[PDB]
Amino acid sequence: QANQKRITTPYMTKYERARVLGTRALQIAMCAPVMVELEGETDPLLIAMKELKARKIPIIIRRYLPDGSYEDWGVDELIISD
Amino acid sequence: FERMREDREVLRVIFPTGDSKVVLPCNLLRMIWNAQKIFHINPRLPSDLHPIKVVEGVKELSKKLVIVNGDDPLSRQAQENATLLFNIHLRSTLCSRRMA
């Protein structure tokens, strides 16, 4: 699929947000590098959540289409609503 | 006004019964009330809102609500039919006269 013309919604779905926080929390729990500041954050959930609010999560969401194609949308390109 | 008269007949054909109660995403009457309280609007003083800004603003907003993405006539027709009932309730609530 041509990345110049992505027809999916520009907002991040509640499910995409759930899986992003979950996988990123797992990564942080496995001693992965952190992108943002950690003033008083240790619980991987709170760290992944602050990273989402900061928009500094290094994950790409591969939205599969029914036809078989896919669109790779990065966490920085999507608009967080909640 | 003519566009609202056409929409009026479109609603008459959609709702043959006199039941104006409809389910829609955003409540305009509450948003308007909230704006009245957020900006301390005085209903007794004259307004500084130009009615042309009201018309142009509603048209630009109607273009920003995109249920279907595509410039082709098939997508524009689907978009125009999906946001139809909302665009009608919007043009009828955000009317230049009512806002004045």
């Binding site: - | 959609i14 709702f15 009932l85």
Partner: protein, 209 residues
């Protein structure tokens, strides 16, 4: 006994005119809304005697896009139509180099005649209708939305837009009353426009099977 027969014949003719007009055939406005009095003056009120006879009610219309693409509508006198009558109409069509025809039976149709309607399909696309189901135009009903037969170009654009195959769209039986009314066969797509209390207007597309 007699005034009802002429009333039925008039109502059937009006429905047939509306049907042909909906299929895209050239139909004049006068005959489209013909009062019962106009019909009695043009055809009669004495079907028991034979004036008018069901053979007189035969209609012949031509398509708006193609003048040579004509269509027949026959009204047999026998309640139960047999294969011989179909052979008569088929030969009639061969003589008049016409390909599409309608048989409005009274009581019904024999099995052999229906099979005869299926074997000569590539040569003569002729359909059957019961007068009992033609006394009312189903498209004017409130439950029946506005159907529109799409063209191969419109279907190609539809499938290319949503990026789907024909077997993925919803289906509609070829024997459906609306499918028979618009005279659609397998492979065609019908566009339905219905009112919606959530969006106002909803356009769906059904594939015939």
């Amino acid at each position: 006994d007699d005034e009802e027969e002429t009333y039925r014949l008039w109502k059937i003719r009006k429905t047939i005119m509306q049907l042909c007009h909906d299929r895209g055939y050239l139909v004049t406005q006068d005959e489209l809304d013909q009062t019962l009095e106009e019909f009695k003056a043009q055809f009669g009120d004495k079907p028991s005697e034979g004036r008018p006879r069901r053979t007189d009610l035969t209609v012949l219309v031509a398509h708006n896009d193609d003048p040579t693409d004509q269509m027949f509508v026959f009204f047999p006198e026998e309640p139960k139509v047999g294969i011989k009558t179909i052979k008569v109409y088929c030969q009639r069509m061969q003589e008049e180099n016409i390909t599409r025809a309608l048989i409005v039976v009274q009581q019904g149709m024999t099995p052999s005649a229906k099979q005869s309607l299926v074997d000569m399909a590539p040569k003569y696309i002729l359909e059957q209708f019961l007068q009992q189901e033609l006394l009312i135009n189903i498209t004017e009903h409130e439950l029946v939305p506005e159907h529109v037969v799409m063209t191969k170009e419109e279907v190609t654009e539809l499938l290319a837009r949503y990026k789907l195959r024909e077997n993925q769209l919803p289906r509609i039986q070829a024997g459906d009353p609306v499918a028979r009314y618009f005279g659609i066969k397998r492979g065609q797509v019908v566009k339905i426009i219905r009112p919606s209390e959530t969006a106002g207007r909803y356009i769906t597309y059904r594939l015939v099977q």
